[PDB]
């Protein structure tokens, strides 16, 4: 009769056996999840990880300039498998040696191996809404054809506030459709981390002021709302331009 | 038959609805039956086995719980809504809702995938179903035509038989899958499959009545022991219970009636009693300090599991493994030594040696309050005449003959000496034992045979040493008797 | 399977000895060098006085 | 607006873009222990419906997890997990390719329904003799 098991399929053939003809191209993976997944992620979850990827430089020929997140608390994925899936998703030449994936996972684990999430600021300290030190976060992004730049207070000492909310809020612009918001939070989680990460190299993750470069890089008390030309850095702009990057 | 191409039916099988389960299970069974050119390869298969074991576990479970699946009044059985959320809510603001809630009026654990296996409350161990192949006639009597056959030879007019035949078919197809490389795919690593085997055993033998046709029970036992035969590697996770289960499974065969409890099987009916000892060798060769050790604890006479174990041993009533000995002592003699030639032997001879191997192996495991001796006008030992047979064959299949005769001799000497020294250590018996030992016609090859042996073949050096030390112990016993 | 398993068993203790003997040899050599050291530091202290 | 013909491997006919089912939780429980507050059935359903809509838009051509990752994220890991999951269940990226056939005909055909022996529910092919009329009927 009819023919359907795998994409409108064929069920009327020379009566053979075919294992999982599902590939868009090398696309079938469900094997070996059930037990491990259940037993593993039935327990608490914790911090995430921003990651940047650059491989187009004149040492290797790529379009690798993408970012993404990650859970260091995870042990469920052969990272290389994820990488290869991403690459095949990038339609690259199947030869993943000239499309060397090893280098990529190297860079990946490299970046992951310098992280602690938020410091004892989360691990043992708990300050209601954090304490202070809202960094003047500066974020510019280049999507589609347009770049967007902004600077604004955003606390490092607080955990109660997650990035993505800022993302969906500033979505209320023209459309800021989709692809934007991610990198923002990524950059956000990027931007903040290093700072306390660098501060982790010292020791103020509990106390107040630090030790020398943290002095210029701060907000102040701000007992009164500001002027128009200073905050005139906070606003945002959408500008077309010929690309030169 | 034909059509019937794809493999990915697993998906539908994985789905939880009666429909898909039927559609696939039946088909794929017919598939694995066909072998003219039809085999189930291994590329990204495993998902199949998982799905299968999961299905069987759940079905057998709620069967033991006596409750039909596939049909309730609940559906899509958790949250359904389109509430106040775009992508990220349930932060601080959620407590405002509480505030909101307090003014408008003017966490969980998750279970694992499968259910538990034992300790199931309803299922509490009571001795039933330790009955031999005899039940076949029971089966006949069951399958016999009668005004009350209650063999709904048709489909499921009630769901009970539905679940029954479901599990039956699953067992069958599982058997058929298990006849090739990809035994490695089944090799003791489909933790799911092993859970399935375990709990299925724990039911079939401790079976409060939910199975319709005893013939179904036979089918289960049968294809189960078969699929076991196609395993030659580890088993026995949460072992002890499983080990005892497997022992009772192999003991299922052979006619019962101290002394040997087993009339040797007249080898023209059965072929499974084979598979039994086949497995009790293969899946028992692993001297890894688990399996052997589990049976060693079975010499004795979460934590509740241990309570279970002894709970069955006294619920099998002294010792018991003597029964295993007697069982092992079947299918070898009394037919080939009673034939008209030694050539038709070679066939079942091929089968024989693993048995003696198993035996002598377990006799490494007997070196404490017992009463054991197993040469008491029960078997004698034609082993000597058999050895002579294979010897005359030698100087007149292959590759198994010499080891068979060798280990036969070793078996003889070891069991002799172990019996002697055991009842020496106990010393609960008169020295008549020696005289008793000295009173066997089936024993101690005559020294004239030794002599003439020492000359003609000259191709049996090790065997010559075997007989040599044998005769040595013989003459020793003779001397020190007085 | 039986033969291979028993052979690996024998070797588990073949390797056992390989170690026991490797580590005794080590201690023996270290002890001898310690003698020589003490003897030298002694002679050296004397010759300085 | 609707502009395509969307089919699915039937056994999947338990999924509903509106609600959730015990199936997926047993396959993706990490959004239901209520342990990680940044995850919830709700955001799950959001992701779910978003991705299935995306695929159903132009299903003739494939859709990647990397795509969604670019679009929206709260995680790469779980995103990939569920994406590949739906892939397996063919709810997504199922009609990536098309296949056709001329389909010659045979004696059985879908428009063939005649009078013949029947396995179904009761039917009586022989009605009544003469003396049956001899009854003081109703």
UniProtKB/Swiss-Prot annotation, chain A:
UniProt signal peptide: none
Domain of life: Eukaryota
Compartments reported by the entry: Nucleus
Summary of the function given for this chain in its UniProt record: Involved in transcriptional activation. Component of the SWI/SNF complex, an ATP-dependent chromatin-remodeling complex, which is required for the positive and negative regulation of gene expression of a large number of genes. It changes chromatin structure by altering DNA-histone contacts within a nucleosome, leading eventually to a change in nucleosome position, thus facilitating or repressing binding of gene-specific transcription factors.
Family as reported in the entry's similarity comment: Belongs to the SNF5 family.
Subunit-structure text: Component of the SWI/SNF global transcription activator complex. The 1.14 MDa SWI/SNF complex is composed of 11 different subunits: one copy each of SWI1, SNF2/SWI2, SNF5, SNF12/SWP73, ARP7/SWP61, ARP9/SWP59; two copies each of SWI3, SNF6, SNF11, SWP82; and three copies of TAF14/SWP29.
Miscellaneous remark of the record: Present with 217 molecules/cell in log phase SD medium.
Protein name per Swiss-Prot or TrEMBL: SWI/SNF chromatin-remodeling complex subunit SNF5
Higher taxonomy: Eukaryota, Fungi, Dikarya, Ascomycota, Saccharomycotina
From Swiss-Prot, chain B:
Compartment annotation: Nucleus
Protein name: SWI/SNF chromatin-remodeling complex subunit SWI1
Gene that this polypeptide is encoded by: SWI1
Domain notes: The prion domain (PrD) is a Gln/Asn (Q/N)-rich domain, which is unstructured in its native, soluble form, and which forms a parallel in-register beta-sheet in its amyloid form. The first 37 residues of this domain are sufficient for aggregation, propagation, and transmission of the [SWI+] prion.
Role this protein plays: Involved in transcriptional activation. Component of the SWI/SNF complex, an ATP-dependent chromatin remodeling complex, which is required for the positive and negative regulation of gene expression of a large number of genes. It changes chromatin structure by altering DNA-histone contacts within a nucleosome, leading eventually to a change in nucleosome position, thus facilitating or repressing binding of gene-specific transcription factors.
Zinc finger feature spans (C4-type): 409-426
Annotated family: Belongs to the SWI1 family.
Subunit structure: Component of the SWI/SNF global transcription activator complex. The 1.14 MDa SWI/SNF complex is composed of 11 different subunits: one copy each of SWI1, SNF2/SWI2, SNF5, SNF12/SWP73, ARP7/SWP61, ARP9/SWP59; two copies each of SWI3, SNF6, SNF11, SWP82; and three copies of TAF14/SWP29.
Organism: Saccharomyces cerevisiae (strain ATCC 204508 / S288c)
Superkingdom field: Eukaryota
UniProtKB/Swiss-Prot annotation, chain C:
Gene name tied to this protein: SNF2
Note: Present with 217 molecules/cell in log phase SD medium.
HSA domain location: 4-49
Domain of life: Eukaryota
Quaternary structure annotation from Swiss-Prot or TrEMBL: Component of the SWI/SNF global transcription activator complex. The 1.14 MDa SWI/SNF complex is composed of 11 different subunits: one copy each of SWI1, SNF2/SWI2, SNF5, SNF12/SWP73, ARP7/SWP61, ARP9/SWP59; two copies each of SWI3, SNF6, SNF11, SWP82; and three copies of TAF14/SWP29.
Protein name: Transcription regulatory protein SNF2
Subcellular localization: Nucleus
Role this protein plays: Involved in transcriptional activation. Catalytic component of the SWI/SNF complex, an ATP-dependent chromatin-remodeling complex, which is required for the positive and negative regulation of gene expression of a large number of genes. It changes chromatin structure by altering DNA-histone contacts within a nucleosome, leading eventually to a change in nucleosome position, thus facilitating or repressing binding of gene-specific transcription factors.
UniProt source species: Saccharomyces cerevisiae (strain ATCC 204508 / S288c)
From Swiss-Prot, chain D:
Portion of the full-length sequence here: 300 to 437 of 825
Organism the protein comes from: Saccharomyces cerevisiae (strain ATCC 204508 / S288c)
Compartments, record wording: Nucleus
Domain SWIRM span(s) in chain numbering: 6-103
Top-level taxon: Eukaryota
Known role: Involved in transcriptional activation. Component of the SWI/SNF complex, an ATP-dependent chromatin-remodeling complex, which is required for the positive and negative regulation of gene expression of a large number of genes. It changes chromatin structure by altering DNA-histone contacts within a nucleosome, leading eventually to a change in nucleosome position, thus facilitating or repressing binding of gene-specific transcription factors.
Name of the protein in its database record: SWI/SNF complex subunit SWI3
Subunit structure, as described in the record: Interacts with RTT102, SWP82 and the N-terminus of SNF2. Component of the SWI/SNF global transcription activator complex. The 1.14 MDa SWI/SNF complex is composed of 11 different subunits: one copy each of SWI1, SNF2/SWI2, SNF5, SNF12/SWP73, ARP7/SWP61, ARP9/SWP59; two copies each of SWI3, SNF6, SNF11, SWP82; and three copies of TAF14/SWP29.
Additional comment: Present with 3150 molecules/cell in log phase SD medium.
């Amino acid at each position: 009769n009819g023919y359907s098991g795998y994409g409108n399929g064929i069920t009327n053939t020379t009566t053979r056996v075919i294992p999982q003809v599902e590939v868009g191209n090398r696309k079938h993976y469900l094997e070996d999840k059930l037990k491990v997944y259940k037993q593993a992620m039935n327990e608490t979850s914790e911090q995430l990880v921003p990651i940047r990827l650059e491989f187009d430089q004149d040492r290797d020929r790529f379009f690798l300039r993408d970012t993404l997140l990650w859970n260091k608390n995870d042990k469920l994925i052969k990272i290389e498998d994820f990488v290869d899936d991403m690459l095949r998703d990038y339609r690259f030449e199947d030869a993943t040696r000239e499309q060397h994936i090893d280098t990529i996972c190297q860079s990946i684990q490299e970046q992951i191996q310098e992280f602690q999430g938020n410091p004892y600021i989360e691990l043992n300290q708990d300050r209601l809404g954090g304490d202070d030190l809202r960094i003047r976060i500066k974020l510019d992004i280049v999507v589609g054809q347009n770049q967007l730049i902004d600077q604004f207070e955003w606390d490092i000492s607080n955990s109660d506030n997650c990035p993505e909310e800022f993302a969906e809020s500033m979505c209320q612009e023209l459309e800021l459709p989709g692809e934007f918001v991610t990198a923002i939070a990524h950059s956000i989680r990027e931007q903040v981390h290093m700072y306390h990460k660098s501060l982790a190299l010292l020791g103020y993750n509990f106390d107040g002021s630090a030790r020398s470069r943290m002095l210029p890089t701060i907000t102040l008390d701000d007992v009164y709302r500001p002027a128009a030309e200073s905050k005139i850095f906070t606003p945002n702009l959408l500008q077309i331009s010929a690309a030169e990057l | 038959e034909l059509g019937a191409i794809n493999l990915h039916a697993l998906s539908m099988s994985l789905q939880s609805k009666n429909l898909g389960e039927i559609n696939t299970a039946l088909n794929t069974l017919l598939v694995t039956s066909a072998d003219s050119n039809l085999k189930i390869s291994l590329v990204k298969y495993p998902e199949l086995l998982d799905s299968l074991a999961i299905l069987g576990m759940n079905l057998l479970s709620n069967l033991s719980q006596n409750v039909v699946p596939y049909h309730r009044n609940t559906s899509d059985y958790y949250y359904e809504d389109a509430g106040s959320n775009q992508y990220y809510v349930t932060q601080h603001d959620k407590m405002v809702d509480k505030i909101f809630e307090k003014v408008n009026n003017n966490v969980k654990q998750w279970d694992l995938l499968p259910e538990p296996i034992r300790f199931l409350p309803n299922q509490f161990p009571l001795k039933i179903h330790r009955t031999p192949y005899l039940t076949s006639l029971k089966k006949i009597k069951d399958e016999i035509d009668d005004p009350f056959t209650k063999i709904n030879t048709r489909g499921a007019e009630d769901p009970k038989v539905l679940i029954n035949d479901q599990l039956s078919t699953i067992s069958m197809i599982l058997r058929n899958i298990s006849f090739s490389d990809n035994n490695s795919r089944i090799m003791s690593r489909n933790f799911y499959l092993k859970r399935f085997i375990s709990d299925l055993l724990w039911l079939v033998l401790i079976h409060p009545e939910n199975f319709t046709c005893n013939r179904k029970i036979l089918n289960f036992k049968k294809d189960l022991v078969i699929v076991l035969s196609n395993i030659s590697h580890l088993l026995e996770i949460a072992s002890s219970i499983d080990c005892l289960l497997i022992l009772i499974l192999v003991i299922s065969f052979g006619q019962p009636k101290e002394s040997l409890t087993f009339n040797e099987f007249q080898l023209q009916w059965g072929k499974y009693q084979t598979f039994g000892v086949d497995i009790l060798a293969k899946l028992f060769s692993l001297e890894k300090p688990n399996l052997n050790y589990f049976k060693s604890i079975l010499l004795n006479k979460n934590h509740k599991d241990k309570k279970l174990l002894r709970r069955l041993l006294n619920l099998y009533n002294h010792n018991l493994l003597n029964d295993v000995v007697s069982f092992l002592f079947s299918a070898i003699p009394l037919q080939q030594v009673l034939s008209q030639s030694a050539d038709p032997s070679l066939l079942i001879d091929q089968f024989s040696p693993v048995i003696s191997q198993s035996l002598t192996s377990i006799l490494v495991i007997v070196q404490l309050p017992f009463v054991w001796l197993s040469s008491e006008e029960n078997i004698g030992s034609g082993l000597l005449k058999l050895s002579e047979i294979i010897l005359n064959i030698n100087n007149s299949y292959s590759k198994v003959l010499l080891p068979s005769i060798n280990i036969s001799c070793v078996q003889l000497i070891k069991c002799l000496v172990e019996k002697s020294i055991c009842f020496e250590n106990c010393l609960n018996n008169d020295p008549e034992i020696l005289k008793k030992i000295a009173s066997i016609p089936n024993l101690f090859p005559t020294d004239l045979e030794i002599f003439q042996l020492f000359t003609n073949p000259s191709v049996d050096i090790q065997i010559i040493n075997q007989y040599q030390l044998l005769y040595n112990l013989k003459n020793d016993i003779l001397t020190n008797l007085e | 399977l039986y033969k291979n398993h028993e052979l690996l068993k024998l070797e588990r203790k073949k390797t056992e000895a390989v170690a026991r003997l490797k580590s005794m040899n080590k201690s023996a050599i270290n002890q001898y060098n310690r003698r020589q050291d003490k003897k030298n530091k002694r002679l050296k202290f004397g010759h300085r006085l | 607006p609707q502009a395509h013909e969307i089919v699915i491997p039937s056994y999947s006919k338990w999924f509903n873009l509106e609600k959730i089912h015990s199936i997926e939780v047993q396959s993706l429980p990490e959004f239901f222990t209520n342990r990680i507050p940044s995850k919830t059935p709700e955001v799950y359903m959001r992701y779910r419906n978003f991705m299935v809509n995306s695929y159903r838009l132009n299903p003739n051509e494939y859709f990647s997890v990397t795509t969604a990752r670019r679009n929206v994220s709260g995680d790469a890991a779980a995103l990939f997990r569920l994406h590949k999951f739906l892939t397996k269940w063919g709810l997504i990226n199922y009609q990536v390719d098309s296949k056709l056939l001329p389909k010659n005909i045979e004696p059985p055909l879908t428009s063939q329904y005649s009078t013949r022996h029947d396995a179904p529910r009761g039917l009586f092919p022989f009605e009544s003799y003469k003396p049956s009329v001899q009854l003081p009927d109703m």
